[model samples]
Target: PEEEKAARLLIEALEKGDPELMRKVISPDTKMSINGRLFTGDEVVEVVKEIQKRGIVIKLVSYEKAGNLWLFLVTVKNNGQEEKVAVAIVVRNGRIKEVIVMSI
Candidate 1:
């Protein structure tokens, strides 16, 4: 049930492109690193907005729970090119405390 909840929160965040939603779902202490660059929550949201401006569409393809982390594989489609991105989310007390993006 927790996994489902986490998945739903992520899906909603992606669909609306609402950084506020992401903020709510993620813990205040959340840390995100993409391609080895560390980012704060605000920075991550800014990147999401940039992606949106580029007309990139995000689709949640799958979700799996490994230990206390929720792993989500999402597809980013732009100009007919699709890229699969793997995100590992660490949740605590119903909030995501950390997020790490892995190269695929």
Candidate 2:
């Protein structure tokens, strides 16, 4: 529940290309599973930058918590193509510990 704020922060940061966002919300060693392959904290930032380069846009459809994990349902758009994804985020100590993304 408390992680709701960070989840919102991430989306806003993404839209504005805030490079500091990853460090602010995600743990330094955080790991994220994208579709299947896993990416570490730095790798995650690179991936985000790549997405931004492609003009990828992320819009939060909704979010809710299950225990310490926050499930964010979002629509990712790129080149007029949009996909629905469920972004699973785990927060601890006021920082994001992990993230897992999967299609709807």
Candidate 3:
């Protein structure tokens, strides 16, 4: 349940466009990948900031634990259009250590 909560928190952070909440769950040295591009934690914050600027809303559709990772299925909504996204997250010691986001 903790793992699920961690992933849920991440989705909530993105939905609310709150970087502070994002930072609270992800480690300072968290590794992040979007599509195929690598990003540092701070850089990911900039990405979230951009999402906020574009007024996007993120909603968690489902989540499942896969070995050491938690896979989250989500929907990104903007201007009445919605897109499905897959997020794979690795949580260690209650903090997210790795995150991978992809479009589907």
Best by TM-score: 2
What is candidate 3's CA lDDT for residue 1?
Answer: 73
RMSD after CA superposition, every candidate? 2.1, 2.2, 2.1
Candidate 1 accuracy as lDDT: 0.74
Ranking by lDDT: 3, 2, 1
Q: Which stretches of candidate 2 lie over 4 Å from their true place?
A: 1-4, 14-17
Q: Least accurate stretch of 10 residues (summed lDDT) in model 1?
A: 20-29
Would you estimate the TM-scores of all the predictions? 0.80, 0.83, 0.81
Number of the top candidate by lDDT? 3
Residue 78, candidate 1: alpha-carbon lDDT: 82
Per-residue lDDT tens digits for candidate 2, residues 1-104, read 53556656766754554667766766668898988989987787777777777778888788777777778788888777889999887877776688898977
Q: Which stretches of candidate 3 lie above 4 Å from their native place?
A: 1-8
lDDT tens digits by residue: candidate 3, 1-104: 76556656766765675877776776668888999989886777788788788888888788778666888888988999989999888877766788898999
lDDT of each: 0.74, 0.76, 0.79
Superposition error at 1 for model 2 (Å): 8.8
The candidate, 1 or 2, that scores higher on TM-score is 2
Backbone N/Cα/C clashes per model? 0, 0, 0
Global CA lDDT computed for model 2: 0.76
